[PDB]
Design a protein around this ligand. Sequence first.
Ligand code: RIP
Length: 271
Amino acid sequence: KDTIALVVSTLNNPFFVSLKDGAQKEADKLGYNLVVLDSQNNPAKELANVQDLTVRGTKILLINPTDSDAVDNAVKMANQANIPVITLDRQATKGEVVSHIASDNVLGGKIAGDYIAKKAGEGAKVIELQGIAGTSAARERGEGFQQAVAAHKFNVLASQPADFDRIKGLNVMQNLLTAHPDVQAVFAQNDEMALGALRALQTAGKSDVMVVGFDGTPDGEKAVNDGKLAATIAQLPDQIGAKGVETADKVLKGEKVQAKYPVDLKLVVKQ
Ligand SMILES: O[C@@H]1[C@H](O)[C@H](O)CO[C@H]1O
């Protein structure tokens, strides 16, 4: 059994657990051995993970960068060891990558901003909780969101990173609420931060604020159905992991693949 390795940015996020299960289920199906390594949002740890795999008989490296610019060293190391690299969910700015599989994050941010304008109205006062700064996902969602801003003349009271983390998303929202109690809507770049923000508005008695997340995880989807979360942009993590293993199979077979494989997004609301 050829071994395929999956280096995921973190496992302390439901989105990445689903991504891992999708890859795992497809690996079982195609008869591969899947090794899963966790970088814990640490580029130094990612590098150590990749260096350890290049001598384990790893045939293909599926990688979710902790940082789109910093991952280039790990990619170049996989290149040196003649191990083809496929990026999942986030890009590698440089380094030789056979294929990239991800959602259209620029579209995702605009759609998020457009839904806010539809509910909170044009010229609405918003706060944006951003993801991990150096990743392509956060960067692109912000750009897409900046398009809805200009178009809907939104007044952005504040925009700040909460690192795709639920607890950080809670503390950052907590701190911003004290300074900006007039907030009407919040765009949270993932469901974890969106759920943290919700808890902050809860602790503050500020139930009037409209929160839009991203991912459509089990928790994110439930909060929308319970009426707490206004909407989330559903991604298909399991299919990104599966498509990644599927593509790793073709490369090993000698079949050429596309340099990019998009995955569908879907606005999620109650009913
Ligand atoms: O797309 C992924 C998911 O949104 C995850 O929740 C955080 O990292 C992003 O890159």
